Amino acid sequence: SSGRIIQIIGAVIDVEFERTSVPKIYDALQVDGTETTLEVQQQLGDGVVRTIAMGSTEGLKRGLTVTSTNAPISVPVGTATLGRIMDVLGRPIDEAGPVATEERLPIHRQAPSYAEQAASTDLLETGIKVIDLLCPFAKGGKVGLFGGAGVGKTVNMMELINNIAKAHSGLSVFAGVGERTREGNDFYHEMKDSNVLDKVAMVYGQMNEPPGNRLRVALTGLTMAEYFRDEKDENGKGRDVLLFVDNIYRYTLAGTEVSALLGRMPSAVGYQPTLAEEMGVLQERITSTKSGSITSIQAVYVPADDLTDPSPATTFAHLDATVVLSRDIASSGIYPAIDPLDSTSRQLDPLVVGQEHYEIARAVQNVLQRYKELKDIIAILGMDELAEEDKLVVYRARKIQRFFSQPFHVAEVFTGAPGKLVPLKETIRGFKGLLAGEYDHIPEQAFYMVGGIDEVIAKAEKL
Amino acid sequence: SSGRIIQIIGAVIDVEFERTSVPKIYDALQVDGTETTLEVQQQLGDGVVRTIAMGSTEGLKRGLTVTSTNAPISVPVGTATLGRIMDVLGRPIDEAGPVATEERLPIHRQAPSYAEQAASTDLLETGIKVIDLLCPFAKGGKVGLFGGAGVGKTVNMMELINNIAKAHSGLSVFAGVGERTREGNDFYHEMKDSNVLDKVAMVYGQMNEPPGNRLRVALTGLTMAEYFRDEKDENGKGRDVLLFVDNIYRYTLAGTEVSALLGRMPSAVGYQPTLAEEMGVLQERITSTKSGSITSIQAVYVPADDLTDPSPATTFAHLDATVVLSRDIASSGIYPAIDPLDSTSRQLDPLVVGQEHYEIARAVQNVLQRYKELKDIIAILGMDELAEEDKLVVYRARKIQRFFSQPFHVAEVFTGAPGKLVPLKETIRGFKGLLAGEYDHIPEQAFYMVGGIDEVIAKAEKL
Amino acid sequence: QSARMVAMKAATDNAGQLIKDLQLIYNKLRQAAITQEISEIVGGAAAV
Amino acid sequence: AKNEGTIVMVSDGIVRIHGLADAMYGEMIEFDGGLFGMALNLEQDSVGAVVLGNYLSLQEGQKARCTGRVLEVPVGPELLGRVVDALGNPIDGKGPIDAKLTDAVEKVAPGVIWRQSVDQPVQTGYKSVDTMIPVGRGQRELIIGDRQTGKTAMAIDAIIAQKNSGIKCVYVAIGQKQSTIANVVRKLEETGAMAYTTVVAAAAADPAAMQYLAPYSGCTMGEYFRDRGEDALIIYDDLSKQAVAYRQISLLLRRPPGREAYPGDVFYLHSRLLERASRVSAEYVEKFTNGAVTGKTGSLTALPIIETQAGDVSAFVPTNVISITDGQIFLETSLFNAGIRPAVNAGISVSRVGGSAQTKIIKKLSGGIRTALAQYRELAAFAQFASDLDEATRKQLEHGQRVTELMKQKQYAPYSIADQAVSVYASNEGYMADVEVKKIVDFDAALIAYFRSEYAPLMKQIDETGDYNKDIEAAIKAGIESFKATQTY
Amino acid sequence: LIIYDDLSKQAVAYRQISLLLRRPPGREAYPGDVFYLHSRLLERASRVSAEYVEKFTNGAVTGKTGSLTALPIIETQAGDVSAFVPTNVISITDGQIFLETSLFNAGIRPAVNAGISVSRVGGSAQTKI
Amino acid sequence: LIIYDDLSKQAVAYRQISLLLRRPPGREAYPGDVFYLHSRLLERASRVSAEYVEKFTNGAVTGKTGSLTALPIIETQAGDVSAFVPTNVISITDGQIFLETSLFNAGIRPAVNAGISVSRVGGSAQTKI
């Protein structure tokens, strides 16, 4: 009934039980007298379980007792987890007090059925102009975020968190995989400052923790998001919820290091024998079921600038859209700096999104492409060349670039100006009018941070 | 006590002793009835020590007895070794009878402490053009030559021996050179007829000996150098003995050959797991303490002609002045074939060499580096296309590449041209004149194997 | 002037194609080298 | 007996111990000699243990006893100006260190709720890394490049420039020739920087345990000042040699191999060490000191150094360490040979903290450097044919050239805040459009020299305060005008 | 008519099982038996004679010829047909249909490159019209 | 005078023998002591002195110097000289003669590369003229 440690080499810990009762794969056990709980990763003979500890193993002698929980690591999930910071097992780390929730759920759950979820493409309207125009999302999709620091990535994430609750009454979950402590502290304080922390939950996995912790934290966030989805409102209707994953590249690296620790033979080029199976376990559960929906926004790191590398190749098979944040546009002063020529989607087709939207997006895209091809000439030898057509193309490109920006509701406090949740139809109509040539008289300065279409006109008539 | 052989694979032999008489590490043992001796390498418990045999293992079988000397391999050190040639255990092989010396020291000893470390302050001219300008030497330092097979390391070593050792008095030099026998036998003969064999000791091992002998040759030479420098004649010094080893790589090659048979797992390229410490414990003992001085020159082999190999890469940190030879320059006809770039010396400081020397060296390296990047442009577009400020750089780089060439005293059998010697001031004057734009009308074919500038002028006149 | 521009743009296109091919070869060689080294290391560790 | 153990193997520096039931991980052991040992792997029937010292005196059958104490080092303010090993023993031969208290070598960083943003700055005397890639108290940044490209010079100048700032410095050297360590210490002592500098040394002829456990001890000595409310700075001369030593030790334990033979957990090794350089909040300081210190924060700055082969930044360890730090400084071999002495590559070098770690005047004046360098990077290839370009682009190119040349400096001569500000203001305002490109360094040095003899009081106000005010701007402008009017370079 | 949605994923699954079965990695990306894994499958699609049909059916059916056609799909990375798996299946099939991505992004849909997509039995299957 | 047709085949046979016999493998799938294998053979070629001849012959012949010459042959793949084995053999001998395919197909026969081929004995092994 009770085990005892028999081997300790780095993280890996082999624990021996009775032959009859042996904890299953992925079950969790706790060592009496200490703060360490153990996780089962591989089962061997003689009733010997090979496990990975969830903390630091310094000061751990052999021959200690261990008690079996017989169930996977269950996290407390409920409405009391809103606005709290919790670690991999759910213990608060904000020094604010225990979470009042009693109901708990496992993190290792079977995937939904084949006909369990029925979906028709259905766009999720964020309210942001450029994203809803060029890279429409889809309830149940998975989105890849490209870009580093210095482009306001956190600002975009906060804006999405606020907008989902403002429009679709949707809560959000944040899961950090191998995050820096300084950045996590800054994010927490800034979200507290911006009055967004009340609608979001937090789960952090720090760099200084052993890989067994940074591996199984995405499931911990996913369990909370799934529970939020299945809370029935009066007259059903479930709920739409989001999930942010800080970096899935570090998720794959955590898997690789764990596989190396347990001794599995290397696969192809230095990657775990079992890599794809794991990423299907993660990514598949983010789907649009009948009673609700879960989307996901994920940041992706490309090793060695190699899309052929097995990790990005396994990643890109599940993505539905890619958002590329550019440092150049950020330096230009237009926020958001989302690139309007390198971002793609699988919903930007004439069928799902509607024809008019399709050709509007195509027209703005090749206009921007022409401007990109011409900006080298316009910057090296100036605009002194005489050609009316490309000059008009230049002016329209600049107007579109300024029009892509909009003010957010997160900066109202530091800025003093209000946000704008521009509906999609107004964006479509304004872009059609801009492409037609009706607004060839409005000054280009009248589109900066101007929200919808009409507002532009008044702003222009104000001048 | 006495043991027995229980296993033999090639060179590696492990001898099982009694319970309480297990010999310590490096406790040479004598095999009765044969001229072979064994040295302890590692312990394996149970009263078994895995050893390496010094000498051939042909003629021996399992079951033979062995007697423990309980002391490391000791060599004869004194004034009587001068003018004698001896094998690694110190047995004379010059057919000149025994050596009358009672003083003996072990070849395994610790390293000097941090307290007794002395600085190096005096320059040391050598007569070579490129070395005296781009890589100044200093007494008490460490010098290394880096090359791939067939690029001229030896010839340079013999020129250094002929150019400084024969002139400095009271040197008490030591020769640990190991190379193709033909090259060795000639040396002993050449040294004799010149009547300089009086103040030189030699330790030599061939390439055909089993790994036992090739492993411990350098330690013997180090012991003989350490004794000489430390001793002090009444009112006198240790004679500033000079050490020249031409066999540094074999040490590591034998180490990696026998590492697999000692049970050590493969590492990196496959080099042995303990490469760094094994190289350090030897490369440290060649130092100048406050009680003496040692000036050493080594030859470093570069396998497969890449400098990122773990064997030559570890040795860079252990040297003061580094000289790197390139195969391409050798194939181009320029001798000596030293890469002006990738060669540097710690003594190249404005406070040590002076002010003019530093500027000359930096300007030369700058010109060559600039020329290294103009090849692709010349290829794609014509030579004519590049501006004149780069035509000057190209022509000066070509002239400088040939002017660093000179004929040697030693290597007259190959080319048949008389040898030359150049003092430092002539080198400085010539390079100052060249970088200034003077000698811009002399064709680059007059800078080849011409040595001093006035010889350049005369050779150009002859054309 | 037109002919010079034609030659220059042909050179640019050739250079771009060469860059693409070189990048492909470099990635293939890098992955192959890593795999071969891993195989050798595993074989050596199994032999001992 | 639980304490009593035996020895069954002594080979290559690692000892397998029988018995010793109920031992501990990391718990030191006695070894029947002056040397002690560490218990890294606890197998079913034999404890493995490396030896901290010379293992040639250990033989089969010798005894060992478990102390029950985790490895600890002497720490305090009396270690300033001394040179020790990786265990805390003096080697400089200047007498014993009057130790006061010890601390553990393996600890954990403060939690997330116990941190604070990095606003306090750190100067290095280099105009290259103080206007483009600023460093702040608590930040962790990496210096990476090839061999013989001035990686140590940059690290040492930072320690030298911490005079008049009250930041204690620590220096760790792993896998170096003893003569190099001696010369470094001699140069530190020559300038007077040895007063606030502590040195931990682990040379090449030293067992891999002491080349592996040295940075941890250096960090432990560096943490004393942070918890007390004072600042500190630590530098690791190389983390590549430590990684090599760890690989050697693990391979001798036959732990599962991996890419480049590295063991399973290499990321954790450097992550846990490099996560301890942090800035703590005032509440944490008050709680730790039990109220003896109030209204003061702390900060530990880390500057690891890593060597790459042939310029390959995609190797295992460099990629592990790049993803951990908050910035990267890239030094290029080609730039070094080309004449760029501080040899920084501004294109790829990054700093995540950004302008939050600068004084007001530096932050105000820094933008004109980055703009000019970016424009020169874009327009560099047009040097051959420039007359056809319009005048604005030519002027941008000239400004880029002049700025790129101004970025050069000399080792062992750190600049102060006032000199940096004066130089950057003179560059931005355009007073050096007249001067020739080749003679930028001479003009800059002469102008700095004139001010420190003519406007030293202004410089004192800038140095202590650092605030930038209309009056300061007017004074700087008038002084530069006077120098340009009456002086000859 | 049988269609395999993706065969490269089958190769990946086989590689995973082989590597978990402690078999040696080898110097190639995939084990060497992937070739036989695909060949044993693609060999089973062929037309039989009327006599074999009658022989198997015990005379129930006469004068009718059976058939079976395969249309497997193989996934490539950046248009690299020189990899291990893609070149093993190209050499054991009677034709290839090369769908590009440059044409797909250019609007030409379906994107079929006639220059390199060929058939071997072509001209016999086609009707007279 | 002795000639070895190809020592590469001997190296392959030795690797075979030392692998079928359980010996740990090494760099390039080759085993240990390949350098020793190729060095203990070549070093047996030497020019002995008249004293050695007299002592070996027990005074039967006097005033004579023996000799022995060797010309081993090694083949390479893709025409590279920086391969690990070719260099390991170059470091043993007193010279090398390099034959280039590019020169062979161009009509230059015998194809000898002047730059990469050297002799270490030099003018000592020549007639006066």
Ligand SMILES: Nc1ncnc2c1ncn2[C@@H]1O[C@H](COP(=O)(O)OP(=O)(O)OP(=O)(O)O)[C@@H](O)[C@H]1O
């Ligand atoms: N700013 C500088 N100006 C001039 N020379 C410099 C400068 N920085 C470094 N050097 C030169 O570089 C050499 C020292 O290089 P350094 O020791 O910094 O490099 P490293 O090989 O990376 O260091 P280490 O191996 O000790 O970590 C000396 O020749 C020194 O004069």
Ligand SMILES: Nc1ncnc2c1ncn2[C@@H]1O[C@H](COP(=O)(O)OP(=O)(O)O)[C@@H](O)[C@H]1O
């Ligand atoms: N100064 C020189 N002049 C002419 N030939 C040289 C010179 N230096 C080296 N060589 C040639 O380069 C070859 C290098 O031989 P050696 O140095 O003995 O081998 P290694 O470079 O492996 O030590 C010699 O055979 C010789 O022909």
Ligand SMILES: [Mg+2]
């Ligand atoms: Mg050689």
Ligand SMILES: [Mg+2]
């Ligand atoms: Mg260095």
